[PDB]
Amino acid sequence: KKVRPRLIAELARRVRALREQLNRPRDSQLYAVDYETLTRPFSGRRLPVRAWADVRRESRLLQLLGRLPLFGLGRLVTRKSWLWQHDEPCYWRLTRVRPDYTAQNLDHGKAWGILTFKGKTESEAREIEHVMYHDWRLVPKHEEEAFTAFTPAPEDSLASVPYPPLLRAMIIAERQKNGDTSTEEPMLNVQRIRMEPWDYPAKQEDKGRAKG
Amino acid sequence: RKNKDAVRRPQADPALLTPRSPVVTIMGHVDHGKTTLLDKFRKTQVAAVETGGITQHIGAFLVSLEKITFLDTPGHAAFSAMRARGAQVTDIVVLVVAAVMKQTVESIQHAKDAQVPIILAVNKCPEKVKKELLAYDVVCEDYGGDVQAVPVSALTGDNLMALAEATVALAEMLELKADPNGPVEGTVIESFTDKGRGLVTTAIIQRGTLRKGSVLVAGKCWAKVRLMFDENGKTIDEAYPSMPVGITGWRDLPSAGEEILEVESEPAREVVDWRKYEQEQEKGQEDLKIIEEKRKEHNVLSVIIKGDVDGSVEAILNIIDTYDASHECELELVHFGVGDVSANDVNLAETFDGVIYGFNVNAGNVIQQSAAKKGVKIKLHKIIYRLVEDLQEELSSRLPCAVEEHPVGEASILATFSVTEGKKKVPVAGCRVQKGQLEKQKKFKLTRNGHVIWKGSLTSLKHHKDDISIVKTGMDCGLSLDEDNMEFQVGDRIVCYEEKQIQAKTSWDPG
RNA sequence: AAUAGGUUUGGUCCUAGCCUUUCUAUUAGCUCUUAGUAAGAUUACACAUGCAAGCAUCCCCGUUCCAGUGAGUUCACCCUCUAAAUCACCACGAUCAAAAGGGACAAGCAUCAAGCACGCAGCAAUGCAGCUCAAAACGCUUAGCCUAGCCACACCCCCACGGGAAACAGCAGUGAUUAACCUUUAGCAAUAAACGAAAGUUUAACUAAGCUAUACUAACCCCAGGGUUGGUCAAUUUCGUGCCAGCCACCGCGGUCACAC
RNA sequence: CCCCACUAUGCUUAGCCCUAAACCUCAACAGUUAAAUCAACAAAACUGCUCGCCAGAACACUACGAGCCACAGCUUAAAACUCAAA
RNA sequence: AGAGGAGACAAGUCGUAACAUGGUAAGUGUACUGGAAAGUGCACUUGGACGAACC
Ligand SMILES: Nc1nc2c(ncn2[C@@H]2O[C@H](COP(=O)(O)OP(=O)(O)OP(=O)(O)O)[C@@H](O)[C@H]2O)c(=O)[nH]1
Ligand SMILES: [Mg+2]
Ligand SMILES: [Mg+2]
Ligand SMILES: [Mg+2]
Ligand SMILES: [Mg+2]
Ligand SMILES: [Mg+2]
Ligand SMILES: [Mg+2]
Ligand SMILES: [Mg+2]
Ligand SMILES: [Mg+2]
Ligand SMILES: [Mg+2]
Ligand SMILES: [Mg+2]
Ligand SMILES: [Mg+2]
Ligand SMILES: [Mg+2]
Ligand SMILES: [Mg+2]
Ligand SMILES: [Mg+2]
Ligand SMILES: [Mg+2]
Ligand SMILES: [Mg+2]
Ligand SMILES: [Mg+2]
Ligand SMILES: [Mg+2]
Ligand SMILES: [Mg+2]
Ligand SMILES: [Mg+2]
Structure with missing residues (x-):
């Protein structure tokens, strides 16, 4: 059950890592x-x-x-x-x-x-x-x-949006089944959903680099 | 059985007939300049790039001057069928004669058989050639004959333009027309096995237009056309009549010269099956006869042949069939095939203690090592006469040594003595040597008035109570034989001789 | 092996082997009309050629996937711990799942019976001499498996810096080899993947086609072949043959009146 | 085979060899005769428990491997070809 | 590759070893001997018999 060690695999991995580190473009x-x-x-x-x-x-x-x-x-x-x-x-x-x-x-x-x-x-x-x-x-x-x-x-942005039809119906039905009689429409809070534009700069620190 | 054979279409309607390029085949004797003339026409040089400068294949090239299909037939006596195939498929024959030989006569006979026009090319330039051809029914215009003779110099490229003009004029006179539509009819010029493109056939289209995906049948073989290429290897999208083409996609390798006919669809196979059945029936009939002939009653060289193309294989097999020395040594053809030497060939040679002959084919390191392990002899040649010489050498090796008898001396008996030695009576012949000398090692024969009585070696040679190995001329010697049954008279003769084994060479001649 | 059957012998009973009957798969012989669907090199031997990985305002990301093969082979399953990844960002977590640790895990061979360091304690120095095994250790041979799929490999040297050498076990195809043999089709329209913010682009994945009685389904006004006919086992008339030619899965037939050729 | 003579040997001592139709061809232990007793013959049919062995014939008390003081040996012990029997 | 063994094929040859008390009962182990089955010694087995009152 004891796996025979694969020394050359680790040796080649270390050699590749050293070569990439030294010869980085x-x-x-x-x-x-x-x-x-x-x-x-x-x-x-x-x-x-x-x-x-x-x-x-x-x-x-x-x-x-x-x-x-x-x-x-x-x-x-x-x-x-x-x-x-x-x-x-x-x-x-x-x-x-x-x-x-x-x-x-x-x-x-x-x-x-x-x-x-x-x-x-x-x-x-x-x-x-x-x-x-x-x-x-x-x-x-x-x-x-x-x-x-x-x-x-001024940040005159919307606060809540209507639920999708089936989800709204399911939530209302759950309310009625649990005994709630409130007629308040279920709403979806989009204030926390900050919509950054697609050209907002990203974290360059986490970005990778091309290999050599 | 119902006849499902695919037959050639009836002759094309005059309205459907369309003018086509001419097929011209260059035929002649060995080293008469056919390849050089074709090189000059083609604007490319291939005669120099050859093994020994011998054309060993029939190749078709579409030359653009007008367009013509030139077929280079070999000039050697070996590939007679090849030349015949060209004559069968050509429209015009350019007979090249160096300033008349056996192969020229054979090509003339082939052209007469095919009923095709002949244009004479007097290469290396003539009147003597035409006068000689008068005997062989080739009459020049100077002698009132239809055949046009053109003196040319292929090496210097002289007068070739007029030769091409004469070829074009003869083609125009013939008015070669064919249907460029409908099912394809063609002829196989060669067939071989490329390790990358599978079974490939070099063919010439005679009728209809060939396209990728067309289903063709030739002999016992069929194909779904996969690639159509030219001599350079480039793919061609169409193959009009009188156009050479390399077709790939054959399920089995057709024999050279077999007709190719297009069919509607692959379920072709039936047609092939029918043809196979026909062949079987023919063989069966023969088998029946042989079997009945049996039922009413109630130095062996085995050669494998592997060639690059079926035409070369056929030529080699025809050469083998011309073997007539079966009495001294029996030449058995275990198996012949097309392509590089393979494991099956090595196994067959090992099984029958045969020798593999490879004509223009290779043998990898694995195959060579296997043959060495199994004691198989692979002999790869690139020239047909080299292979013939090697086969003759092997046959001679199989032949037993031939004993040469050289007379050494001669002695005539004079007296008969009976010597009592070891309680045994030994008859001793007193002999006088007349010509030559007698040696103990050399053998002897006994002659009685011209008849040969005994053949062997003396048990004891003795002179004057002394053993002497060699007795010179005029020396008396008592001779005793190992055979006691031999009777010695007063007038008998003895002839001494030396026997030497000599190498025996096969009596078979390839010509 | 079953609802069993034939066959030992001059005959019976018992034991027993062999074969028959059934159902598949591959190949071969003979034969074959159409439609739909499913499936489809013998080979880890070598490969011509064409394609199979791009996308995108440049960086990045992907090309580590899909696809293939079964050479090798108790890396697959459960538990513990916890990497990478997704949930924009922490998720003060969830899902998914490497390495590591524990356990479980194919067949035949005992004419493979000993392995030869395979253990423990101590922080360490070092000390003890043990550890596995007829309840199968150690070793040899065979084999992909436990199939919504999983494991292994990716030309060979188990690995791959390096070396041998120049790689289709990707698709279509070919050489050799075998009893074994699918087109060198089209499209990204559907789904899936990659990329983009997106319109979208690419994809031999895949989809829709091609070939093949290998299988199933269905039909055809006309269109049927193959095997068998002594018993087991459904079913033979007449000639020829004369222990010859020949047949048989087993028992057996054929020597001039053959239900067996 | 019958008769005569004699040796190894049979006996003693000290080691080996380790085989038999070593068979009462019927394993040890505990129990039953109840029945459905029971292929045949033999020395009646069985039950519970355990160990050892067996799986068509012949090849085969054989070959190879291994172990043994055994060296023309003993123990363990196959396979291939063959048959439809034994 | 010279040979040995087994099985089949089945001949011819030399005997008749086994099956009846097979004409010396058969067989096991073992030892020696022999052209060959086999013979003999020693111990063992019945997978032989001893005829089954006395005579
Ligand atoms: N003097 C002279 N020699 C020529 C001329 N043309 C060709 N030759 C030579 O003649 C030889 C002809 O032999 P090949 O080139 O093999 O042509 P071939 O007649 O087909 O010979 P094969 O291929 O063996 O049948 C060439 O080697 C040329 O060197 C010519 O016009 N004049
Ligand atoms: Mg030439
Ligand atoms: Mg395999
Ligand atoms: Mg053994
Ligand atoms: Mg395997
Ligand atoms: Mg490969
Ligand atoms: Mg590797
Ligand atoms: Mg492929
Ligand atoms: Mg092939
Ligand atoms: Mg198949
Ligand atoms: Mg995305
Ligand atoms: Mg005595
Ligand atoms: Mg005493
Ligand atoms: Mg006893
Ligand atoms: Mg014994
Ligand atoms: Mg023994
Ligand atoms: Mg031994
Ligand atoms: Mg007797
Ligand atoms: Mg007796
Ligand atoms: Mg005795
Ligand atoms: Mg004696």
């Missing part, structure tokens, strides 16, 4: 893009069609941060997609920047900031996602006050 290697063919030479995968124009027009976050003192710590950065989708100020307040030293132009790396999406800031700074995207723009120092200027519109 850099951000510049991963996110390099051939603007003539719109492909990443690291893996030779074409970018999606809808991004093509952006790849040909906009710039990356580090592509802007590399031309600022201390790599732009404290500056405000926005995204073109946010500007085209939402009218309220959507941007990031930089708190830490880790550029990739292996990039000749130092136009790659990670960045951390406090997100202010549609006028609402976040209590803590966190890693900025979609840094490598050709979607970013820099808020001017003289325009920071004007751009961040936003009056919070």
Whole structure:
């Protein structure tokens, strides 16, 4: 019943782990893009069609941060997609920047900031996602006050919604069966269901990384 | 049994007839430039890329000058059937003669049998050739004959344009037309087994248009056309009349030269079954006769043959059947097949102590190791005459050694003595050596006035009471035989001889 | 083995083996009209060719799934503990389920009877000399299993850094091999999966087709073959054969009047 | 086979060998004669409990493996081919 | 691969070992001996008989 040990399996697993840790690719290697063919030479995968124009027009976050003192710590950065989708100020307040030293132009790396999406800031700074995207723009120092200027519109949102027909009927029948005679319509509380827009930035910390 | 056979369609209606390309077959003698001329026409070189520079296969190529279907027949005497098949399927025969040989005469006979026009190509350039052909019923236009003769130089590519012009003119005169619609009628040019594409047949379409999924029957075989390719391997979506095509999808490998007919659907099988039944009946009749002939009463070389194509196998089998030395050694054909040497061939050779001959086929390391383990001899050749020579060598090896008798000396008896030695009376012949010398080791024979009485070795050779091994000419010697029954007279003769074993070579000749 | 039957012998009784009768599956012979459905290489031997994994405003995610094979084989089930995953986010938990621990878990062979360290105590040093086994240890051979499905493998070296070498046990197909042999079809319209916020895109999964009497269902104005005919066991007239040719599942037949060829 | 002579041997001592138609071919223990007694013969038919053994004939008191002071041995002990019997 | 064994095939040859008291009753173990079944010694068995009052 005693399984014969499989030493080579563990040996190969450790060797693979060590090789991956030592030979891990850099951000510049991963996110390099051939603007003539719109492909990443690291893996030779074409970018999606809808991004093509952006790849040909906009710039990356580090592509802007590399031309600022201390790599732009404290500056405000926005995204073109946010500007085209939402009218309220959507941007990031930089708190830490880790550029990739292996990039000749130092136009790659990670960045951390406090997100202010549609006028609402976040209590803590966190890693900025979609840094490598050709979607970013820099808020001017003289325009920071004007751009961040936003009056919070009242949150005039609905509170409860009607139940689905069969569920409402079943709940009413259960009420009657248990003896309740209340005519109050069953309602579904949607206040706790905060509907974040699909372009709300996600937790870059939990996001994975491409393999080498 | 009801007749379910699929028969050739009746001759096409004149309205349905449509002009088609011509089928031209290049025939001639060994090394007369047929392959070189075809290479010049095809704009590609393949004569150089061959094993020994010998055409051992009949290949069909669609050349675009107009379009023609050129068939390269082998020039060797071995593949006679192959040449005949070309004559059977061709519309025009280009007879290539180097500046008349046996195979040229055979090709002329084949063309006469097929009733096909002949264009003479005097390669390596002529009047002597035409004058000789006058005897073989090939008359040139200079001699009032219909056959057009064109002197050409294939190596230098001279006068080939006029040769093509003459071919096109003859094709136009023939007015070759066929129905490009309806059930397909064609002929198999070759059949083989590709390890990736299965059983494949090189065929020529004679009537109708062949398409993927068409159900065909040829001999005892049938197919649902799976891939139609050309000489280059590229798939072709249609096969018009007078177009070579490699067809894949045969459930069984057809024999070369068998007609291919299209049928409505696979449940083809019935047709095949019927044909099989017919063959069985024929065999059964023969069997019955043989069986009745029995019932009224009441140095063995076994060869396996594995060839690349059925045509080459047929040629080798025809060569084998020309064996006439059965008395000295019996040549038994255990099994013949198409494809690389396989486990069944090795098992058959091991069972019958035979030898496998592989013509243009391979044998993997596993097969070779198995043959070595089982004592099987696989002999792979790429040239037919090399295989023939190897078979002749094996047959000669099977033959017993031939004893050569060389006379060494001759002695005439003079007197007969009776010597009492060991309580035994030994007759001793006093002999005088006349010509040559006598040796104890060499054998002797006794001659009585020309008759041969005894054959053997002396039990004791003694001269002047002394044993001497070799007695020179003129020396007296007393000779005693091991056989006491032999009687010695006054006028008997003795001839000494040396026997040497010599290698015996097979009397069979492949020609 | 049953509602049993034939067969030992000059005959009876008993014991006993063998075979018959029944139901499936595969292959072979002969034969075969159609429709629907189900099922479908012999082979862990080698593979030509075409396809089978993308999606998506770039990052990510997936390609670890589905699909396949049965080579190997008490990794499958129960309990304890608790990873990864889903419930947006903690769920101060639920579901699902790895590793680890305990238990249970195929067949034949004892002409496989000893294994040879297979145990315990101590924090450790180290000490004790034990542990399993005829209630089958140890070993050899065989085999996928306990089937809403599960286990194992993924060309071989159990593993796979590495080496051998260049991989269809994915689909269609082929070579070899075997008694054994499905199309080199179409579509993502349905469901499932992957991706996306989504319209949707992709999928040889799958769906809808193709071939095959392998099976079941149903029918046809016309269209029926195969086997058998001494007994078991339903059913033979006349010729020929002459212990020959031949037949038989068992008992047996055939030597000039054969219900058995 | 019958007659005569003699040896190993039969006997004693010390070790081995470990086999028999070693069979009363009828296992040990406890109990019954009630019946439905009971294939045949033999030495009547049975019940409870336990152990050992058996599963067509022949191959086969055999081969191989293993153990033994046994070395032409003893114990355990097969299989293949064959038959429709034994 | 030279050979040994078993079974079948079944001949011919040399005897007649077993089945009747099989003409020496048969057999077991064992030892020796023999062309062959087999013979003999020793002990054992009835899967033989001793005729079943006296005579
Ligand atoms: N002098 C001369 N030699 C030629 C000419 N054409 C061809 N040859 C040579 O003749 C030889 C012809 O033999 P092959 O090329 O094998 O053609 P073949 O006549 O079909 O011979 P097989 O294939 O064996 O039947 C070639 O090797 C050429 O070198 C020519 O026009 N002039
Ligand atoms: Mg040539
Ligand atoms: Mg298997
Ligand atoms: Mg044994
Ligand atoms: Mg297995
Ligand atoms: Mg494979
Ligand atoms: Mg592996
Ligand atoms: Mg496949
Ligand atoms: Mg095949
Ligand atoms: Mg089948
Ligand atoms: Mg989703
Ligand atoms: Mg005496
Ligand atoms: Mg005494
Ligand atoms: Mg006793
Ligand atoms: Mg004994
Ligand atoms: Mg023994
Ligand atoms: Mg032994
Ligand atoms: Mg007697
Ligand atoms: Mg006696
Ligand atoms: Mg006695
Ligand atoms: Mg004696």
